[PDB]
Specification:
part of a larger assembly; 6 chains; A: about 190 residues; mainly alpha; about 50% helix; C: about 300 residues; 13 helices; Glutamate receptor ionotropic, NMDA 1 (chain A); Glutamate receptor ionotropic, NMDA 2A (chain C); membrane protein
């Protein structure tokens, strides 16, 4: 038992190929070693589960935005109502040095800026964003719906055809023609 | 902590499957070991005491069974880690207190400044 | 409300008014009371790599048994390879046996990633014929409302047959719905889904699933007609929304516990899996015992 | 403290009762299988 | 109608070489409602903007044809030179707070209808009052998706 | 702490049971071989019953 036997028995039992059998004091010691080998397997497979299973932008509530950094520069498109909902409220003063100094001409420029990884995030009307998030897999719309407006129609104050349009607009909700456009233009894709 | 949480029916299914193993091992002997051999070989390999060795088609089938036995051990030990490691009062911000229920009745001592800091504020 | 508007008992009338197109015919209106509508409340490649590597090691075993000649690689050594998924080259195989044990540990961590990271639901909406043909399912479906509702008018516009179903079950209170969900007497509920959003969060245990994960069906304040107040109201209104003060009221009045909904997975299992795989195994014998030594 | 078994004790009781019933059937079954091996 | 290049609301795609819209089909295989839309080619200032009528696709077209049915109108559909809503901004002499863009185009008489999903303004309603709005949303945030390990 | 003493107790129980079963094959070394088998099963009809408790020891490994 002195040349290559207990070599291959260490490779039997320390690999736990043969866990059982394979003077008495050396056997006591070796089965303590096999206990160690079981412990080591337990610890590393615990790490296999651990380091795979174990341990962002939330919205305006971030100090990333309440204290807006130049590592987090953001933008819009000028002449937008988005910039109006900016310029109405107060504490976007720190933000207007991003949202008025970096802006675009189309939202697609900002979409590319996410794709080109130019600016870190953008703030736009949720519809196209969630569409393209379902369409392309670069896009996670975080935050809430901010300034929850409705999407209405440019009608002059003396234009009297808000009226039967509003009745239709009503037949749309009541009979799901809204939901029909959800079928026909909204509810399509995923990641 | 407990006894078995794991749906005693499933444990019965384990017993049924082991006897199915015994049936499938003892039948195919005569088609190319018939009394208590493959009983104790099912208890060898389905217990994975001897995982390796212990015609060819029955052996294919049995090593598929040993693969199952390894899967079952993996799933239940995953549950051993899971149901032990897997899934209160925060303050005034609770709806337990903002909407104070009579399942959550609370109190102070009267003539206290604690009640003063109560009676100053509004909500 | 509408009698008090029309017969001008309440010259102003506020409510949580489901502003109908029908009501808009009768009454002028401001902005929607809140967003609302109608809701329903209720309770590969690794494998091929494995085949390749096992065939490699089986062939290596064949060659090493050929080079002991200066016990069956067809037989015994393959069942050994099976056992080591779960004699000097056999030392090198014990190395790869220890490898196979490492791969066992890896997909235990993987199946832990599966069985932690489930959440399931049942009802879609009006697209279910559960609603539309309830008696074409056993048990027939059980859905009622508090009468004389605008949502009821909308279903009169949609399916008064469905009202024929609802009148088998129609209720009078929201607590009627609380009982009939917690006692299973009616199956789920569709109302103005905002009330469901309070009280679903304000459920005990919150198993009473509502009208989808908040899928508003019946999607999207009374003004007596010709009231001059309307522009005053609605410009004020932008500012309230432009100030988010409605959201401050939302922080006041909304939430219960479904506001802290926490990825309601299982917390034993009865997945099929092997119930597929068992259907394979017997047929394997049906392959082989026809292929006997016929000649 | 910070809490750093009952499953254990349940396993102790179950395995103990099973081994006791097994051993007190061992002698009976050895005797009857000696009678059956006489056949 | 002047149309902001807002997809899918208006997919602004070119016509054929015919100058015509094609016969493209939905997922349901249905002939998609397409609209000739007049407006610039090089849709940027300082570039030669060539008003081409181009194919248009979307929600709002479907709605306008619904209103052609229920309402008996014809619809004169154009592209924006700005591609922008257009807000009250000051002209040179640095005081002239004037609605630009689409707001300017109604308030100049040049557009007489804006058919667009317009985020309503207490301020825009001070000049141009909406009908009943479609969608009840708000601004959300595009975030980059992180890669795997 | 207390789980350890339980382990020592139960292993001595099963070793004694092995001694008795080797005494009742007489109508290979319980001092020797069977103990190293007990070690291996921490990590011949009564040996079937030990394989039961070996599967138990594997359950304790999982725990």
């Amino acid at each position: 038992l002195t040349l290559s036997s207990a070599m291959w028995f260490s490779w039997r039992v320390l690999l736990n190929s043969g866990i059982g059998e394979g003077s008495f004091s050396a056997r006591i010691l070796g089965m303590v070693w096999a206990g160690f080998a079981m412990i080591i397997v337990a610890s590393y497979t615990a790490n296999l589960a651990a380091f795979l299973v174990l341990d962002r932008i939330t919205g305006i509530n971030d100090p990333r935005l309440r204290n807006p950094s130049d590592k987090f520069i953001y933008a819009t498109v000028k002449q937008s109502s988005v910039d109006i909902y900016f310029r109405r409220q107060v504490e976007l003063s720190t933000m207007y040095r991003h949202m008025e100094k970096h802006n675009y001409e189309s939202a697609a420029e900002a979409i590319q800026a996410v794709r080109d990884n130019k600016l870190h995030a953008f703030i736009w009307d949720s519809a196209v964003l969630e569409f393209e998030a379902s369409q392309k897999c670069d896009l996670v719309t975080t935050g809430e719906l901010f300034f929850r407006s409705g999407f209405g129609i440019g009608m002059r104050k003396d234009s009297p055809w808000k009226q039967n349009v509003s009745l239709s607009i009503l037949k749309s909700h009541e009979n799901g023609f809204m939901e029909d456009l959800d079928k026909t233009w909204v509810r399509y894709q995923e990641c | 902590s407990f006894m078995q949480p794991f749906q005693s029916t499933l444990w019965l299914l384990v017993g049924l499957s082991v006897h199915v193993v015994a049936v499938m091992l003892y039948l195919l002997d005569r088609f190319s070991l018939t009394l208590s051999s493959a009983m104790w070989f099912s208890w060898r390999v389905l217990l994975n005491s001897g995982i390796g060795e212990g015609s060819f088609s029955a052996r294919i089938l049995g090593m598929v069974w040993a693969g199952f036995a390894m899967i079952i051990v993996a799933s239940y030990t995953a549950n051993l880690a899971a149901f032990l490691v897997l899934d209160r009062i925060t303050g005034i911000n609770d709806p337990r207190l903002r909407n104070p229920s009579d399942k959550f009745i609370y109190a102070t001592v009267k003539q206290s400044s604690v009640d003063i800091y109560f009676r100053r504020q509004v909500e | 409300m509408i009698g008090e508007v029309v017969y001008q008992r309440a010259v102003m009338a506020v409510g949580s008014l489901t502003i109908n197109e029908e009501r808009s015919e009768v009454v002028d209106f401001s902005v929607p009371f809140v967003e609302t509508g109608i809701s329903v409340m209720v309770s590969a490649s690794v494998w091929v790599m494995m085949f390749v590597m096992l065939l490699i090691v089986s062939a290596i075993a064949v060659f090493v048994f050929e080079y002991f000649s200066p016990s069956f690689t067809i037989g015994k050594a393959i069942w050994l390879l099976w056992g080591l998924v779960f004699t000097t080259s056999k030392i090198m195989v014990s190395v790869w046996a220890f490898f196979a044990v490492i791969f066992l540990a890896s997909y235990t961590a993987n199946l832990a990633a599966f069985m932690i990271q489930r959440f399931v639901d049942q009802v879609t909406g009006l697209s279910d014929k559960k609603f539309q043909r309830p008696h074409d399912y056993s048990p027939p479906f059980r859905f009622g409302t508090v009468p004389n509702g605008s949502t009821e008018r909308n279903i009169r516009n949609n399916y008064p047959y469905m009202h024929q179903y609802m009148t088998k079950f129609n209720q009078k209170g929201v607590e009627d719905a609380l009982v009939s969900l917690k006692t299973g007497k009616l199956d789920a509920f569709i109302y103005d889904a905002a009330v469901l959003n309070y009280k679903a969060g304000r459920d005990e245990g919150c198993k009473l699933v509502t009208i989808g994960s908040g899928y508003i069906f019946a999607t999207t304040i009374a003004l007596q007609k010709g009231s001059p107040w309307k522009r005053q109201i609605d410009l004020a209104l932008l500012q309230f929304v432009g100030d988010g003060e409605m959201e401050e009221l939302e922080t006041l009045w909304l939430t219960g516990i479904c506001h802290n909904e926490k990825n309601e997975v299982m917390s034993i299992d009865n997945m099929a899996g092997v119930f597929y795989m068992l259907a394979a195994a017997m047929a394997l014998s049906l392959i082989t015992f026809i292929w006997e030594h016929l000649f | 403290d910070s809490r750093s078994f009952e499953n254990m004790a349940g396993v102790f009781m179950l395995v103990a009762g099973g081994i006791v019933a097994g051993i007190f059937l061992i002698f009976i079954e050895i005797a009857y299988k000696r009678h059956k091996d006489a056949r | 109608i002047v149309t902001i290049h807002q997809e899918p609301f208006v997919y602004v795609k070119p016509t054929l070489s015919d100058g015509t819209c094609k016969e493209e089909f939905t997922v349901n295989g249905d002939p998609v409602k397409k609209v000739i839309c007049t407006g610039p080619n090089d849709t940027s200032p300082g570039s030669p903007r060539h008003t081409v009528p181009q194919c248009c696709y979307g929600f709002c077209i479907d709605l306008l044809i619904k209103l052609a049915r229920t309402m008996n109108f014809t619809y004169e559909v154009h592209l924006v030179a700005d591609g922008k809503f257009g807000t009250q901004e000051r002209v040179n002499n640095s005081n002239k707070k004037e609605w630009n863009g689409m707001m300017g185009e109604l308030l100049s008489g040049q557009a007489d209808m804006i058919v667009a999903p317009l985020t309503i303004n207490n301020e825009r309603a001070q000049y141009i009052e909406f009908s009943k709005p479609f969608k009840y949303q708000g601004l959300t945030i595009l975030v980059k998706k992180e890669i795997p390990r």
